[PDB]
Ligand binder design. Structure first.
Ligand SMILES: Cc1nc(NC(=O)N2CCC[C@H]2C(N)=O)sc1-c1ccnc(C(C)(C)C(F)(F)F)c1
Lengths: 999, 227
């Protein structure tokens, strides 16, 4: 199983400096050897074989070099230690013992399987054990994706190898927004090209004035001038591992686009193609042993009977017999989150005797069962003690697919281990939850019985399914297609949409609404919908993503969505929405599907995608609902990612050391002072095992950032209760002085960072919409990555302080005076403008999202005036359950301190031309998000099964429908936003004209 | 009375949740004139009522209507406000107790998993150490026989001393596993008790919130209106 902790032994976080190790010799002798904690296995083996001469039967011992050590790890695995350079403290030993054996079996395969097991947090040998044929079929069949990707990487070597490892970090379009193009001097960019001249590695500066749309080769051509040369070189960003290897306009590269925007000087480095081409290892994939092993009918439409399922008994329930009256089994037949017929309950039985032996009859004809049909069930309790009032509560839930991965309808007897009810879920059924039995068998087990039809029942083939077997309305269809995914759809509209299903093809983006109009409990309507899906024109990827959420479970519908992504989703947008795409994998009925194949292919053909794909899957390996699926997926990724596996193992081991160090501070050393904790911190960090693991690896926040040597004098335990570690590394890039010299990251062990990760992603998407519309509202979506169960990394924003830090260094003018002192003379206006623009972005984003209340400690300001928010924690209607009030809060109220800055110290702050301009930025920002409401609703909808407590149902998403006033007109929505700002600030918010909203 | 005014789609969903077929209520359109919501096949059907019902010409089954049960049974605002304060105080206390119970539930469930993994590691360790006894036995027999016939007493004693060391270590590992199995057995029982406590608090917490929300709605209704 996965490691209980990150400690050096079971029940011991750190080994003492010297430790007794029990060594089991192959002659049956036991030798106790005192070893140094950091000693390598080669040292220990040499020390052991010298000592073994002083023991009986020594003559039976072959040469020292003929053996390796084996031991039990904290994962309960018998691990063979082929790499004898490893230290005793890094072996993850369960107990301090080592057994001496002769190496047997496939050495190469065992070494790779260990490296994969380490990356994923679980031994790969656990998969070989699994009896489920769906699991063994996935392991074998996914290898075609692995093979396809690896060949495509070596196809045009070494360029295709360079494009894999260092893909172009580019925007989705070369088109420049007005305010960005106008920052250029007649469509021309001033760029600085640096050259490392050998043999003394001197830096030469070349200032080039070229067109913005100049392709990288053209930039090189000009550097020569200030024939043979043009084609022998490559461009790299100074200070990081980002390369310009593809023929894109220079301005389309995010670094350049960002440089134009910020009015910053782009600092590039020119180097020879071969200097990079040589450093790229030729990646090799090898077919695993399990791909070379000897493994281990009627149609549904001819079955003339209604659906029925027998509920036998449950092993037990955990209820207080004096508090609950009865228990029963609630069941339902679902297609997504939509029941296909009414829910059916068993009879109520005593708490102490969970036995039903009841056939439940469903209002559905067996041939009418759609392909993605699921049985959603739970054991519920009933308390009927006040009047005729009853309180029904779920005890445990479970979901099953009525058809398996081979299209076989469930039959005979089935035992299902039920799952605990998620925190906050009050619904009796959990249809959004995963399918299958709980791997933990020490849970209530519900015995079921499905019907037998004297044979194996199979879902009809596609050929059989394509049986055919049979002016103002244009404006109405255009209106329905523009509505948000969670807007109300009437039965009249459903009938209207189904009637015009063949004309719907002319407006392809109407498909999600048309699919919700279909009667999924009718094989006649579904067969017709299937024929339309097959020939349906492709929709935009941002629209296709909706068809991957928990509301669209149909494999043909999901198949269509994947094909739109394969054809139109750019690597930029895939990286942007990767968090959502990994999450919707949890909604997939089966392990093998088109979405998992598409994502794995992309992760194995672009290392930027691969890096975050690995960490998003790895971060959830602790969660038993997805552990097997994500483990199998990660195995296939690690088997084919090439050399990147070694870089990922370095990140994994550096993270494990940090988890262990913080566990010590939070557990054993919890009652010690900051001073005593800091002494232990510096001493432990200076050990060779720690220095080796925490230096010279890639940043998990950004793999283009190299983490060199630690600056230990800058490393510290923060004053917060969870004991966050502030860490500082040197940037080892030869031209680090041009980007940043210090890479600072906060490591936090204790808080769930998933909600903050999602908020920071949403902020980044909002900022991009704003920029692409001519609105320069600078946000600061700092890096945040969850790496496990309530463990993650936060990117430090340097030269920034909280409002409280500024105030403690006061009156309402302190903040403005502080900004004046930091931005003197001619740079003052730029600071006020940046504060104003950043304020407007944060004002709008926080109001739309309903994030946690702002105060002086969760608002930060950079020296240059850039304002930003930290520690989001909460979002949406997080105060509804707690206080029951029906309101849309304004978390970021612009107090006098903020108004004084915006108005440059004016007496009447709201009456200024500065405040009028600020209001206009807010109004435009708000309407820009409202116009893109579908994307945000879809992004939140794709996160419903993530397990975040504040994002559990479509009703939680309803909050954004209110803040964006989606049921109102654009004019009413703006009046609504102004009213919210006026109510929160006690007046001050104005506009131009009430009746038509024209200046 | 089935007419419910300016209540959201989400409020209707809560009122129609797990209800029988035919259950309905007419509310103000979400901004468009009136919406009829009918419970059919475990789903809430939205039927628009156009005004100039839902048929081609507006010539102006619905079995059970959701009517506007009085949870609040007080005369005046002061008594209602006093009761809201009492229910809200009990609610916040019970919510805090539930959160504390949930954290202990998670911690216990996690520690149970850690102990279960460690037991498997103990089982694998004990096997290795027993295999070592067996290895020592297979080799020892032929050498013990030789040293006895040769007359080396101190050599047989050395082989015996090492075997005793191996057996005492095995006994210590076995006893450590036995103690872990005991701690797991006691923690598994603690888990069931925490699950039971949470299964008792959950219905009471939901009823308390609903009553609090009802008294809040009464106060809003009786107080000075318009916004
Ligand atoms: C993005 C960011 N940047 C920072 N920068 C500084 O703290 N600086 C930078 C200058 C010195 C120092 C200071 N202001 O004293 S803190 C920070 C941040 C973001 C999100 N959460 C946090 C915490 C502290 C709540 C967490 F999670 F780590 F515990 C911090």
């Amino acid at each position: 199983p996965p490691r209980p902790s990150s400690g050096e032994l079971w029940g011991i976080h750190l080994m003492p400096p010297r430790i007794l190790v029990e060594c089991l010799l192959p002659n049956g002798m036991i030798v106790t050897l005192e070893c140094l904690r950091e000693a390598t296995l080669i040292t220990i083996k040499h020390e052991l074989f010298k000592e073994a001469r002083k023991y009986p039967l020594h003559q039976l011992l072959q040469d020292e070099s003929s053996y390796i050590f084996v031991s039990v790890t904290q994962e309960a695995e018998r691990e063979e230690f082929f790499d004898e350079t490893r230290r005793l403290c890094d072996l993850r030993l369960f107990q301090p013992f080592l057994k001496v054996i002769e190496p047997v079996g496939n050495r190469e395969e065992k070494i790779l399987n260990r490296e994969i097991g380490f990356a994923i947090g679980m031994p790969v040998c656990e998969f070989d054990m699994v009896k489920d044929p769906e699991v063994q079929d996935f392991r074998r069949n996914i290898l075609n994706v692995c093979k396809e990707a690896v060949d495509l990487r070596d196809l045009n070597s070494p360029h295709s190898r360079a494009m894999y490892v260092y893909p172009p970090n580019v925007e989705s379009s070369p088109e420049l927004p007005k305010h960005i193009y106008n920052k250029l001097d007649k469509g021309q960019i001033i760029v600085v090209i640096w050259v490392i001249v050998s043999p003394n590695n001197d830096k030469q500066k070349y200032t080039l004035k070229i067109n913005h749309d100049c392709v990288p080769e053209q930039v090189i051509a000009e550097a020569i001038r200030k024939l043979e040369y043009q084609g022998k070189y490559i461009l790299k960003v100074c200070g990081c591992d980002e390369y310009f290897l593809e023929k894109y306009p220079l301005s389309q590269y995010k670094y350049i686009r960002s440089c134009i925007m910020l009015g910053r000087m782009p600092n590039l480095m020119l180097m020879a193609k071969e200097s990079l081409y040589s450093q790229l290892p030729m990646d090799c994939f090898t077919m695993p042993s399990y791909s070379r092993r000897i493994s281990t009918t009627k149609s549904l439409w001819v079955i003339n009977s209604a659906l029925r399922i027998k509920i036998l008994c449950a092993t037990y329930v955990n209820v207080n017999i004096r508090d609950i009256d009865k228990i029963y089994v609630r069941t339902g037949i679902y297609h997504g989150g939509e029941p296909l017929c009414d829910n059916v309950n068993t009879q109520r039985v005593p708490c102490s005797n969970p036995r039903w032996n009841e056939w439940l009859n469903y209002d559905i004809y067996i041939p009418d069962l759609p392909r993605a049909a699921r049985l959603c069930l739970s054991i519920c309790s009933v308390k009927g003690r006040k009047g005729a009032k009853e309180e029904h509560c779920p005890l445990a839930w479970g979901n099953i697919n009525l058809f398996d991965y081979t299209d076989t309808l469930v039959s005979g007897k089935m035992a299902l281990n039920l799952w605990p009810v998620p925190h906050g879920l009050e619904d009796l059924l959990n249809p959004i939850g995963v399918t299958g039995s709980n791997p933990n068998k020490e849970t209530p087990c519900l015995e079921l019985e499905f019907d037998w039809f004297s044979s194996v029942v199979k879902f009809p083939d596609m050929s059989v399914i394509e049986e055919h077997a049979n002016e103002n309305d244009k404006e109405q269809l255009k209106a329905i297609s523009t509505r948000d995914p969670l807007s109300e759809i009437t039965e009249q509209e459903k009938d209207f949409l189904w009637s015009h299903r063949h004309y719907c093809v002319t407006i392809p983006e109407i498909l999600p609404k048309l699919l919700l109009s279909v009667k999924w409990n009718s094989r006649d309507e579904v067969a017709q919908m299937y024929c339309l899906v097959k020939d349906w024109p492709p929709i935009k990827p941002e629209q296709a993503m909706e068809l991957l959420d928990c509301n669209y479970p149909d494999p043909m519908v999901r198949g269509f969505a994947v094909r739109c992504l394969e054809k139109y989703l750019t690597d930029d947008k895939l990286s942007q929405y990767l968090i959502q795409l990994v999450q919707v994998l949890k909604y997939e009925q089966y392990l093998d599907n088109l979405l998992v194949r598409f994502l794995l292919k992309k992760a194995l053909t672009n290392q930027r995608i691969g890096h975050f794909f690995f960490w998003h899957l790895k971060s959830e390996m602790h969660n038993k609902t997805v552990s097997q699926r994500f483990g199998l997926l990660l195995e296939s990724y690690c088997r084919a990612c090439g050399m990147y596996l070694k870089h990922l193992n370095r990140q994994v081991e550096a993270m494990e050391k940090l988890i262990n160090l913080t566990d010590i501070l939070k557990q054993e050393k919890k009652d010690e002072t900051q001073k005593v904790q800091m002494k232990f911190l510096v001493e432990q960090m200076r050990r060779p095992d720690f220095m080796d693991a925490l230096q010279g690896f890639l940043s998990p926040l950004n793999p283009a950032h190299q983490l060199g040597n630690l600056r230990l004098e800058e490393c510290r335990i923060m004053s917060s209760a969870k004991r966050p570690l502030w860490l500082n590394w040197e940037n080892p890039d030869i031209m680090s002085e041009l980007l940043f010299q210090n890479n600072e990251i906060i490591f936090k062990n204790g808080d769930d960072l998933r909600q903050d990760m999602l908020t920071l992603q949403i902020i980044r998407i909002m900022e991009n919409i704003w920029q692409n519309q001519g609105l320069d509202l600078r946000m600061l979506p700092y890096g945040c990555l969850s790496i496990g169960d309530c463990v993650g990394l936060i990117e430090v924003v340097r030269n920034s302080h909280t409002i409280m830090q500024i105030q403690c260094k006061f009156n309402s003018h302190t903040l403005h005076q502080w900004l004046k002192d930091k931005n003197k003379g001619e740079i003052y206006d730029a600071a006020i403008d940046l504060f104003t623009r950043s304020c407007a972005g944060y004002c709008v984003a926080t109001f739309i999202l309903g994030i946690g209340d702002r105060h002086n400690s969760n608002i930060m300001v950079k020296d240059d005036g850039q304002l930003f928010h930290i520690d989001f924690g909460h979002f949406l209607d997080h105060k509804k359950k707690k206080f029951g009030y029906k309101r849309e809060r304004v978390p970021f109220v612009l107090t006098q301190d903020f108004l004084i800055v915006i108005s440059k110290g004016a007496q009447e702050c709201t009456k200024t031309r500065e405040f009028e301009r600020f209001q206009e930025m807010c109004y435009k920002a708000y309407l820009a998000i409202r116009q893109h409401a579908n994307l945000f609703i879809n992004l939140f909808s794709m996160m419903l099964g993530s397990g975040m407590p504040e994002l559990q149902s479509f009703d939680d998403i309803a909050y954004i429908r209110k803040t964006l006033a989606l049921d109102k007109t654009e004019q009413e929505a703006l009046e609504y936003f102004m009213k919210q700002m006026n109510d929160a600030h006690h007046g001050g918010w104005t506009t131009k004209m009430d009746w038509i909203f024209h200046t | 009375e089935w007419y419910w005014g300016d209540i959201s789609r989400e409020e209707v969903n809560e009122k129609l949740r797990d209800t029988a077929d035919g259950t309905f209520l007419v509310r103000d359109a979400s901004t468009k004139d009136y919406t009829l919501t009918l419970r059919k096949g475990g789903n809430n059907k939205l039927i628009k009522i156009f005004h100039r019902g839902f048929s081609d010409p507006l010539t102006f089954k619905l079995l059970y209507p959701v009517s506007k049960d009085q949870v609040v049974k007080e005369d005046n605002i002061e008594a209602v406000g006093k009761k809201l304060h009492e229910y809200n105080t009990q609610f916040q206390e019970k919510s805090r107790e539930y959160d504390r119970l949930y954290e202990e539930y998670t911690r216990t469930s996690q520690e149970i998993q850690m102990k279960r993994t460690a037991i498997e590691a103990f089982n694998e360790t004990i096997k290795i150490f027993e295999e070592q006894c067996q290895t020592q036995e297979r080799y020892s027999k032929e050498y013990i026989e030789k040293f006895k016939r040769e007359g080396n007493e101190k050599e047989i004693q050395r082989i015996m001393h090492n075997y005793d060391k191996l057996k005492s270590r095995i006994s210590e590992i076995i006893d450590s596993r036995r103690r872990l199995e005991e701690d797991l057995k006691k923690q598994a029982a603690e888990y069931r008790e925490i699950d039971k406590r949470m299964n008792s608090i959950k219905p009471d917490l939901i009823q308390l919130r609903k009553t609090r929300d009802q008294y809040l709605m009464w106060l809003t209704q009786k107080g000075v209106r318009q916004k």
